[PDB]
């Protein structure tokens, strides 16, 4: 649990997140909780050129390491960590199906029992706000109060969990749910969903 | 036909089922018939970390190996084996197109002559029921009485055959049929299908 | 131009045709013209298990090599070779977008200038007929009289050219055209196409 | 910055452009600015057979290297270089989603903040014109006056930037935007877009 181990995993998560086709416009950003702030992917360096010595450390004040620029979308990583104390890893990306549902400005409702992996009966879509600003972070923070993933209108996805492995898995899982909403949405509207009672049983079960 | 050979193939089938993109939410489960019960993939271990010593053995009583937890979706593997005596391998997954057709609650009708690979003129969709419960298994069992694959509403697919190779092939084939239903369903409804007489000739031919 | 070189290329074309995702239900069949008949992929053996000693030779009488079963869909390979004397390689497959357009029973019209790669202003769809029968071959033969690729209703695609390389390329190219018809067909109908005059200029140009 | 280094990168860009699935009908063409003209991929040789000694040099007069045929779609590479003095690399391709939007003859509007990567609030679609002719080049030149990528009706995409890396990245990014337009276009029309004011803030920000 040395800095460098965490820096390798973030790099492995970038490489695996690209494997699954979740990191397409090279929009992916990965962060882990560390010390009193986080370890995050920097700006500029496309994943395959990424070395442990590239990962930037940002403190709880928001001050960063001298000589390294943090990702350009870093402050909502900090908002997610502050709003959800249990999160230890954050995943961001412009995966195409999530973003497609985020352009229609819709929540993804309980069309499948795995919807409960993010804490409830949906995956909400937070309102649009210029990237990198504080107003964007307020939206993310409000949205993650009772869910672990959220779409961000006209933009993409933020997923958070106990570690990188689950966070990656949750982001991947939201994409599949996304895709399923869009494919069935083209045929019928609304889409058949599981009732709130059914979703409370599944939640208990997990 | 030692335990360990069967444990490698299940592992190869997991790895190949991921190759084809049939195992996406890491929802895949593979089982083979063995002795008086089956050999199945356990819960927790994502496929690439899977070793022969991970495969769990569940007997016909439903009792499992001490110290190993069976997949969380194991009892409908047992229902499929009991309902279809000829099955020797079972494949389960949340492949995206199958699941998309399962959210609309529809059967996939004879839109293509390969529909006959699953025993008849369609691929039925069994009604929804909380995962892992006995009511879910009753649906699966009723659904596999005269077909070898079935969708499961709001959930995914169960495919069964004489061995792993064909079972994998059948599941893969149902996904392609699925995808074809959805792509043409967006354009026209209903979709043109082959008549029952045409499908009886193809069945005879196989 | 020994038998064995031709048997390797057919095998390479199977392996590459799978690379591009054109051979999905393991429906692919490849044939080359040889001597007074052809060299074709046999029945049973999935591509990766395929060895040079698997390729079957069928003569112009339709008699095959003792001890080897030809593909189950071999006689329309023979019809394509007889109808189009210039063809030296034939490619068949159930690629998903081609087959999707073949289930709607539609021709793919000149929506893109590459449509001219198959000889004219469209890719026709031959009427349905039980696989492997002579009535199916009559359709294929009529359809390839003035085109090099044809969809086959409720089934897939046959593409033919001067060698394996181009045949593979033509089949691949028809899939992309297919996909483009389906994606734009979901939005508008009819789809904008290039005029017959524009298509005669492009034909001259190739 | 020797000829040969530039010839390797063009070849690497072809190989990577195929990795991402941007070069499907083997329609891809890559060019870099060099001396008083450019270095471009030749006609005939499919990418994997491509060697440094294949790259053709075309001068500002349009005269080419003796014994090597330039790509068949080379003159709009020259139009892009002349119209956009800052471009040092050009990417062309028939990527399927771009081409799908180009068959409907539509611009891709600001449905996502990354639309600003190409200089403004859209990605325009230049009118159709027989490939390889001068009238086609006039369209491209007019279209790139104030944008860095343009669709070309009934055909595909041209993207241009400071180097190969960014050009490749921009083309890739237009495909994702394309795909997003098409997926949401099937559900609703028109599609929600970001206002011109929002897009002026994002532009300033980049
Ligand atoms: Zn972002
Ligand atoms: Zn399941
Ligand atoms: Zn066939
Ligand atoms: Zn072109």
PDB file of N, CA and C in Angstrom, chain A residues 114-190:
ATOM      1  N   UNK A 114     -29.668  -5.751 -12.036  1.00  0.00           N
ATOM      2  CA  UNK A 114     -28.337  -5.261 -11.682  1.00  0.00           C
ATOM      3  C   UNK A 114     -28.258  -3.750 -11.416  1.00  0.00           C
ATOM      4  N   UNK A 115     -29.334  -3.025 -11.742  1.00  0.00           N
ATOM      5  CA  UNK A 115     -29.469  -1.608 -11.467  1.00  0.00           C
ATOM      6  C   UNK A 115     -29.206  -1.347  -9.975  1.00  0.00           C
ATOM      7  N   UNK A 116     -29.578  -2.297  -9.131  1.00  0.00           N
ATOM      8  CA  UNK A 116     -29.354  -2.262  -7.705  1.00  0.00           C
ATOM      9  C   UNK A 116     -27.877  -2.279  -7.348  1.00  0.00           C
ATOM     10  N   UNK A 117     -26.940  -2.686  -8.226  1.00  0.00           N
ATOM     11  CA  UNK A 117     -25.518  -2.572  -7.875  1.00  0.00           C
ATOM     12  C   UNK A 117     -25.139  -1.109  -7.551  1.00  0.00           C
ATOM     13  N   UNK A 118     -25.860  -0.074  -8.007  1.00  0.00           N
ATOM     14  CA  UNK A 118     -25.401   1.282  -7.695  1.00  0.00           C
ATOM     15  C   UNK A 118     -26.126   1.901  -6.516  1.00  0.00           C
ATOM     16  N   UNK A 119     -26.792   1.071  -5.706  1.00  0.00           N
ATOM     17  CA  UNK A 119     -27.458   1.502  -4.481  1.00  0.00           C
ATOM     18  C   UNK A 119     -28.955   1.668  -4.465  1.00  0.00           C
ATOM     19  N   UNK A 120     -29.624   1.663  -5.622  1.00  0.00           N
ATOM     20  CA  UNK A 120     -31.049   1.876  -5.634  1.00  0.00           C
ATOM     21  C   UNK A 120     -31.748   1.454  -6.902  1.00  0.00           C
ATOM     22  N   UNK A 121     -32.868   2.074  -7.254  1.00  0.00           N
ATOM     23  CA  UNK A 121     -33.681   1.746  -8.417  1.00  0.00           C
ATOM     24  C   UNK A 121     -33.363   2.509  -9.689  1.00  0.00           C
ATOM     25  N   UNK A 122     -32.290   3.260  -9.703  1.00  0.00           N
ATOM     26  CA  UNK A 122     -31.866   3.989 -10.884  1.00  0.00           C
ATOM     27  C   UNK A 122     -30.392   4.406 -10.849  1.00  0.00           C
ATOM     28  N   UNK A 123     -29.971   5.016 -11.946  1.00  0.00           N
ATOM     29  CA  UNK A 123     -28.690   5.662 -12.186  1.00  0.00           C
ATOM     30  C   UNK A 123     -29.114   7.075 -12.653  1.00  0.00           C
ATOM     31  N   UNK A 124     -28.964   8.089 -11.842  1.00  0.00           N
ATOM     32  CA  UNK A 124     -29.392   9.443 -12.123  1.00  0.00           C
ATOM     33  C   UNK A 124     -28.484  10.184 -13.079  1.00  0.00           C
ATOM     34  N   UNK A 125     -29.069  11.246 -13.629  1.00  0.00           N
ATOM     35  CA  UNK A 125     -28.237  12.005 -14.591  1.00  0.00           C
ATOM     36  C   UNK A 125     -28.151  13.389 -13.964  1.00  0.00           C
ATOM     37  N   UNK A 126     -26.948  13.841 -13.596  1.00  0.00           N
ATOM     38  CA  UNK A 126     -26.781  15.159 -12.972  1.00  0.00           C
ATOM     39  C   UNK A 126     -26.816  16.225 -14.067  1.00  0.00           C
ATOM     40  N   UNK A 127     -27.379  17.377 -13.771  1.00  0.00           N
ATOM     41  CA  UNK A 127     -27.479  18.467 -14.742  1.00  0.00           C
ATOM     42  C   UNK A 127     -26.148  18.913 -15.321  1.00  0.00           C
ATOM     43  N   UNK A 128     -26.136  19.421 -16.554  1.00  0.00           N
ATOM     44  CA  UNK A 128     -24.935  19.927 -17.183  1.00  0.00           C
ATOM     45  C   UNK A 128     -24.282  21.137 -16.522  1.00  0.00           C
ATOM     46  N   UNK A 129     -22.963  21.259 -16.591  1.00  0.00           N
ATOM     47  CA  UNK A 129     -22.251  22.386 -16.037  1.00  0.00           C
ATOM     48  C   UNK A 129     -20.845  22.315 -16.624  1.00  0.00           C
ATOM     49  N   UNK A 130     -20.286  23.442 -17.041  1.00  0.00           N
ATOM     50  CA  UNK A 130     -19.000  23.526 -17.678  1.00  0.00           C
ATOM     51  C   UNK A 130     -18.009  22.619 -16.977  1.00  0.00           C
ATOM     52  N   UNK A 131     -17.300  21.756 -17.677  1.00  0.00           N
ATOM     53  CA  UNK A 131     -16.321  20.870 -17.065  1.00  0.00           C
ATOM     54  C   UNK A 131     -15.316  21.686 -16.235  1.00  0.00           C
ATOM     55  N   UNK A 132     -14.771  20.994 -15.230  1.00  0.00           N
ATOM     56  CA  UNK A 132     -13.785  21.528 -14.352  1.00  0.00           C
ATOM     57  C   UNK A 132     -14.203  22.616 -13.404  1.00  0.00           C
ATOM     58  N   UNK A 133     -15.412  23.142 -13.435  1.00  0.00           N
ATOM     59  CA  UNK A 133     -15.840  24.188 -12.511  1.00  0.00           C
ATOM     60  C   UNK A 133     -16.446  23.637 -11.241  1.00  0.00           C
ATOM     61  N   UNK A 134     -16.625  24.542 -10.284  1.00  0.00           N
ATOM     62  CA  UNK A 134     -17.158  24.181  -8.963  1.00  0.00           C
ATOM     63  C   UNK A 134     -18.643  23.872  -9.063  1.00  0.00           C
ATOM     64  N   UNK A 135     -19.372  24.512  -9.991  1.00  0.00           N
ATOM     65  CA  UNK A 135     -20.804  24.231 -10.087  1.00  0.00           C
ATOM     66  C   UNK A 135     -21.011  22.801 -10.565  1.00  0.00           C
ATOM     67  N   UNK A 136     -20.104  22.287 -11.378  1.00  0.00           N
ATOM     68  CA  UNK A 136     -20.170  20.909 -11.846  1.00  0.00           C
ATOM     69  C   UNK A 136     -19.987  20.003 -10.605  1.00  0.00           C
ATOM     70  N   UNK A 137     -18.989  20.269  -9.764  1.00  0.00           N
ATOM     71  CA  UNK A 137     -18.761  19.461  -8.594  1.00  0.00           C
ATOM     72  C   UNK A 137     -19.945  19.428  -7.645  1.00  0.00           C
ATOM     73  N   UNK A 138     -20.743  20.493  -7.535  1.00  0.00           N
ATOM     74  CA  UNK A 138     -21.898  20.525  -6.635  1.00  0.00           C
ATOM     75  C   UNK A 138     -22.895  19.491  -7.146  1.00  0.00           C
ATOM     76  N   UNK A 139     -23.156  19.521  -8.454  1.00  0.00           N
ATOM     77  CA  UNK A 139     -24.020  18.478  -9.052  1.00  0.00           C
ATOM     78  C   UNK A 139     -23.614  17.029  -8.784  1.00  0.00           C
ATOM     79  N   UNK A 140     -22.340  16.691  -8.958  1.00  0.00           N
ATOM     80  CA  UNK A 140     -21.781  15.374  -8.737  1.00  0.00           C
ATOM     81  C   UNK A 140     -21.986  14.908  -7.278  1.00  0.00           C
ATOM     82  N   UNK A 141     -21.679  15.831  -6.363  1.00  0.00           N
ATOM     83  CA  UNK A 141     -21.780  15.621  -4.943  1.00  0.00           C
ATOM     84  C   UNK A 141     -23.242  15.381  -4.615  1.00  0.00           C
ATOM     85  N   UNK A 142     -24.164  16.170  -5.118  1.00  0.00           N
ATOM     86  CA  UNK A 142     -25.566  15.921  -4.805  1.00  0.00           C
ATOM     87  C   UNK A 142     -26.109  14.604  -5.306  1.00  0.00           C
ATOM     88  N   UNK A 143     -25.712  14.260  -6.527  1.00  0.00           N
ATOM     89  CA  UNK A 143     -25.978  13.029  -7.237  1.00  0.00           C
ATOM     90  C   UNK A 143     -25.368  11.796  -6.580  1.00  0.00           C
ATOM     91  N   UNK A 144     -24.197  11.853  -5.944  1.00  0.00           N
ATOM     92  CA  UNK A 144     -23.610  10.670  -5.348  1.00  0.00           C
ATOM     93  C   UNK A 144     -24.010  10.472  -3.900  1.00  0.00           C
ATOM     94  N   UNK A 145     -24.799  11.402  -3.354  1.00  0.00           N
ATOM     95  CA  UNK A 145     -25.259  11.264  -1.965  1.00  0.00           C
ATOM     96  C   UNK A 145     -25.851   9.870  -1.824  1.00  0.00           C
ATOM     97  N   UNK A 146     -26.731   9.428  -2.744  1.00  0.00           N
ATOM     98  CA  UNK A 146     -27.248   8.087  -2.423  1.00  0.00           C
ATOM     99  C   UNK A 146     -27.194   7.000  -3.482  1.00  0.00           C
ATOM    100  N   UNK A 147     -26.158   7.139  -4.320  1.00  0.00           N
ATOM    101  CA  UNK A 147     -25.904   6.286  -5.451  1.00  0.00           C
ATOM    102  C   UNK A 147     -24.391   6.255  -5.614  1.00  0.00           C
ATOM    103  N   UNK A 148     -23.885   5.268  -6.338  1.00  0.00           N
ATOM    104  CA  UNK A 148     -22.434   5.155  -6.505  1.00  0.00           C
ATOM    105  C   UNK A 148     -21.965   5.485  -7.916  1.00  0.00           C
ATOM    106  N   UNK A 149     -22.903   5.667  -8.823  1.00  0.00           N
ATOM    107  CA  UNK A 149     -22.596   6.071 -10.150  1.00  0.00           C
ATOM    108  C   UNK A 149     -23.672   7.111 -10.525  1.00  0.00           C
ATOM    109  N   UNK A 150     -23.254   7.990 -11.397  1.00  0.00           N
ATOM    110  CA  UNK A 150     -24.098   9.029 -11.950  1.00  0.00           C
ATOM    111  C   UNK A 150     -23.699   9.436 -13.368  1.00  0.00           C
ATOM    112  N   UNK A 151     -24.730   9.692 -14.190  1.00  0.00           N
ATOM    113  CA  UNK A 151     -24.344  10.183 -15.523  1.00  0.00           C
ATOM    114  C   UNK A 151     -24.224  11.701 -15.325  1.00  0.00           C
ATOM    115  N   UNK A 152     -23.568  12.264 -16.331  1.00  0.00           N
ATOM    116  CA  UNK A 152     -23.398  13.725 -16.194  1.00  0.00           C
ATOM    117  C   UNK A 152     -23.857  14.212 -17.553  1.00  0.00           C
ATOM    118  N   UNK A 153     -24.932  14.968 -17.622  1.00  0.00           N
ATOM    119  CA  UNK A 153     -25.513  15.449 -18.853  1.00  0.00           C
ATOM    120  C   UNK A 153     -24.602  16.029 -19.926  1.00  0.00           C
ATOM    121  N   UNK A 154     -24.668  15.551 -21.183  1.00  0.00           N
ATOM    122  CA  UNK A 154     -23.823  16.108 -22.211  1.00  0.00           C
ATOM    123  C   UNK A 154     -22.353  15.829 -21.919  1.00  0.00           C
ATOM    124  N   UNK A 155     -22.096  14.703 -21.208  1.00  0.00           N
ATOM    125  CA  UNK A 155     -20.698  14.501 -20.888  1.00  0.00           C
ATOM    126  C   UNK A 155     -20.262  13.080 -20.664  1.00  0.00           C
ATOM    127  N   UNK A 156     -20.808  12.326 -19.680  1.00  0.00           N
ATOM    128  CA  UNK A 156     -20.278  11.002 -19.412  1.00  0.00           C
ATOM    129  C   UNK A 156     -20.671  10.384 -18.090  1.00  0.00           C
ATOM    130  N   UNK A 157     -19.680   9.695 -17.486  1.00  0.00           N
ATOM    131  CA  UNK A 157     -19.895   8.952 -16.243  1.00  0.00           C
ATOM    132  C   UNK A 157     -18.802   9.003 -15.201  1.00  0.00           C
ATOM    133  N   UNK A 158     -19.210   9.072 -13.932  1.00  0.00           N
ATOM    134  CA  UNK A 158     -18.438   8.999 -12.728  1.00  0.00           C
ATOM    135  C   UNK A 158     -18.988   7.776 -11.939  1.00  0.00           C
ATOM    136  N   UNK A 159     -18.111   6.843 -11.547  1.00  0.00           N
ATOM    137  CA  UNK A 159     -18.455   5.664 -10.789  1.00  0.00           C
ATOM    138  C   UNK A 159     -17.495   5.600  -9.589  1.00  0.00           C
ATOM    139  N   UNK A 160     -17.997   5.095  -8.452  1.00  0.00           N
ATOM    140  CA  UNK A 160     -17.102   5.095  -7.310  1.00  0.00           C
ATOM    141  C   UNK A 160     -17.331   3.837  -6.470  1.00  0.00           C
ATOM    142  N   UNK A 161     -16.318   3.309  -5.812  1.00  0.00           N
ATOM    143  CA  UNK A 161     -16.520   2.095  -5.017  1.00  0.00           C
ATOM    144  C   UNK A 161     -15.374   1.944  -4.020  1.00  0.00           C
ATOM    145  N   UNK A 162     -15.312   0.792  -3.371  1.00  0.00           N
ATOM    146  CA  UNK A 162     -14.341   0.493  -2.326  1.00  0.00           C
ATOM    147  C   UNK A 162     -12.926   0.361  -2.805  1.00  0.00           C
ATOM    148  N   UNK A 163     -12.735  -0.053  -4.047  1.00  0.00           N
ATOM    149  CA  UNK A 163     -11.413  -0.167  -4.627  1.00  0.00           C
ATOM    150  C   UNK A 163     -11.481  -0.008  -6.156  1.00  0.00           C
ATOM    151  N   UNK A 164     -10.316  -0.030  -6.850  1.00  0.00           N
ATOM    152  CA  UNK A 164     -10.324   0.118  -8.290  1.00  0.00           C
ATOM    153  C   UNK A 164     -11.075  -0.945  -9.056  1.00  0.00           C
ATOM    154  N   UNK A 165     -10.903  -2.157  -8.559  1.00  0.00           N
ATOM    155  CA  UNK A 165     -11.494  -3.336  -9.202  1.00  0.00           C
ATOM    156  C   UNK A 165     -13.002  -3.193  -9.254  1.00  0.00           C
ATOM    157  N   UNK A 166     -13.615  -2.915  -8.093  1.00  0.00           N
ATOM    158  CA  UNK A 166     -15.072  -2.781  -8.117  1.00  0.00           C
ATOM    159  C   UNK A 166     -15.541  -1.529  -8.862  1.00  0.00           C
ATOM    160  N   UNK A 167     -14.755  -0.440  -8.718  1.00  0.00           N
ATOM    161  CA  UNK A 167     -15.151   0.811  -9.365  1.00  0.00           C
ATOM    162  C   UNK A 167     -15.155   0.506 -10.855  1.00  0.00           C
ATOM    163  N   UNK A 168     -14.107  -0.102 -11.396  1.00  0.00           N
ATOM    164  CA  UNK A 168     -14.033  -0.403 -12.812  1.00  0.00           C
ATOM    165  C   UNK A 168     -15.218  -1.247 -13.207  1.00  0.00           C
ATOM    166  N   UNK A 169     -15.484  -2.296 -12.410  1.00  0.00           N
ATOM    167  CA  UNK A 169     -16.592  -3.196 -12.634  1.00  0.00           C
ATOM    168  C   UNK A 169     -17.915  -2.439 -12.624  1.00  0.00           C
ATOM    169  N   UNK A 170     -18.080  -1.465 -11.705  1.00  0.00           N
ATOM    170  CA  UNK A 170     -19.364  -0.750 -11.630  1.00  0.00           C
ATOM    171  C   UNK A 170     -19.570   0.107 -12.881  1.00  0.00           C
ATOM    172  N   UNK A 171     -18.498   0.739 -13.374  1.00  0.00           N
ATOM    173  CA  UNK A 171     -18.573   1.630 -14.536  1.00  0.00           C
ATOM    174  C   UNK A 171     -18.906   0.771 -15.730  1.00  0.00           C
ATOM    175  N   UNK A 172     -18.232  -0.384 -15.764  1.00  0.00           N
ATOM    176  CA  UNK A 172     -18.501  -1.270 -16.904  1.00  0.00           C
ATOM    177  C   UNK A 172     -19.951  -1.693 -16.933  1.00  0.00           C
ATOM    178  N   UNK A 173     -20.463  -2.142 -15.800  1.00  0.00           N
ATOM    179  CA  UNK A 173     -21.843  -2.539 -15.562  1.00  0.00           C
ATOM    180  C   UNK A 173     -22.813  -1.417 -15.897  1.00  0.00           C
ATOM    181  N   UNK A 174     -22.599  -0.159 -15.577  1.00  0.00           N
ATOM    182  CA  UNK A 174     -23.495   0.957 -15.959  1.00  0.00           C
ATOM    183  C   UNK A 174     -23.567   1.131 -17.472  1.00  0.00           C
ATOM    184  N   UNK A 175     -22.459   0.801 -18.189  1.00  0.00           N
ATOM    185  CA  UNK A 175     -22.449   0.928 -19.651  1.00  0.00           C
ATOM    186  C   UNK A 175     -23.389  -0.103 -20.250  1.00  0.00           C
ATOM    187  N   UNK A 176     -23.274  -1.342 -19.763  1.00  0.00           N
ATOM    188  CA  UNK A 176     -24.159  -2.385 -20.258  1.00  0.00           C
ATOM    189  C   UNK A 176     -25.593  -1.969 -19.968  1.00  0.00           C
ATOM    190  N   UNK A 177     -25.872  -1.413 -18.768  1.00  0.00           N
ATOM    191  CA  UNK A 177     -27.265  -1.039 -18.442  1.00  0.00           C
ATOM    192  C   UNK A 177     -27.687   0.045 -19.429  1.00  0.00           C
ATOM    193  N   UNK A 178     -26.827   1.071 -19.586  1.00  0.00           N
ATOM    194  CA  UNK A 178     -27.008   2.113 -20.580  1.00  0.00           C
ATOM    195  C   UNK A 178     -27.411   1.598 -21.980  1.00  0.00           C
ATOM    196  N   UNK A 179     -26.576   0.773 -22.576  1.00  0.00           N
ATOM    197  CA  UNK A 179     -26.774   0.156 -23.855  1.00  0.00           C
ATOM    198  C   UNK A 179     -28.128  -0.514 -23.942  1.00  0.00           C
ATOM    199  N   UNK A 180     -28.475  -1.221 -22.865  1.00  0.00           N
ATOM    200  CA  UNK A 180     -29.768  -1.902 -22.816  1.00  0.00           C
ATOM    201  C   UNK A 180     -30.896  -0.872 -22.789  1.00  0.00           C
ATOM    202  N   UNK A 181     -30.682   0.282 -22.154  1.00  0.00           N
ATOM    203  CA  UNK A 181     -31.794   1.235 -22.145  1.00  0.00           C
ATOM    204  C   UNK A 181     -31.998   1.740 -23.577  1.00  0.00           C
ATOM    205  N   UNK A 182     -30.937   2.171 -24.213  1.00  0.00           N
ATOM    206  CA  UNK A 182     -30.956   2.687 -25.559  1.00  0.00           C
ATOM    207  C   UNK A 182     -31.483   1.668 -26.556  1.00  0.00           C
ATOM    208  N   UNK A 183     -30.953   0.465 -26.639  1.00  0.00           N
ATOM    209  CA  UNK A 183     -31.522  -0.549 -27.566  1.00  0.00           C
ATOM    210  C   UNK A 183     -33.016  -0.794 -27.415  1.00  0.00           C
ATOM    211  N   UNK A 184     -33.561  -0.875 -26.186  1.00  0.00           N
ATOM    212  CA  UNK A 184     -34.974  -1.159 -26.002  1.00  0.00           C
ATOM    213  C   UNK A 184     -35.786   0.117 -26.185  1.00  0.00           C
ATOM    214  N   UNK A 185     -35.213   1.266 -25.834  1.00  0.00           N
ATOM    215  CA  UNK A 185     -35.847   2.577 -26.025  1.00  0.00           C
ATOM    216  C   UNK A 185     -36.171   2.822 -27.489  1.00  0.00           C
ATOM    217  N   UNK A 186     -35.383   2.334 -28.441  1.00  0.00           N
ATOM    218  CA  UNK A 186     -35.662   2.507 -29.858  1.00  0.00           C
ATOM    219  C   UNK A 186     -36.902   1.754 -30.333  1.00  0.00           C
ATOM    220  N   UNK A 187     -37.229   0.647 -29.710  1.00  0.00           N
ATOM    221  CA  UNK A 187     -38.350  -0.199 -29.979  1.00  0.00           C
ATOM    222  C   UNK A 187     -39.558   0.332 -29.204  1.00  0.00           C
ATOM    223  N   UNK A 188     -39.509   0.300 -27.879  1.00  0.00           N
ATOM    224  CA  UNK A 188     -40.675   0.829 -27.152  1.00  0.00           C
ATOM    225  C   UNK A 188     -40.315   1.883 -26.111  1.00  0.00           C
ATOM    226  N   UNK A 189     -41.299   2.701 -25.729  1.00  0.00           N
ATOM    227  CA  UNK A 189     -41.184   3.820 -24.785  1.00  0.00           C
ATOM    228  C   UNK A 189     -42.560   4.053 -24.152  1.00  0.00           C
ATOM    229  N   UNK A 190     -42.673   3.952 -22.845  1.00  0.00           N
ATOM    230  CA  UNK A 190     -41.541   3.641 -22.005  1.00  0.00           C
ATOM    231  C   UNK A 190     -41.141   2.184 -22.080  1.00  0.00           C
TER     232      UNK A 190
END
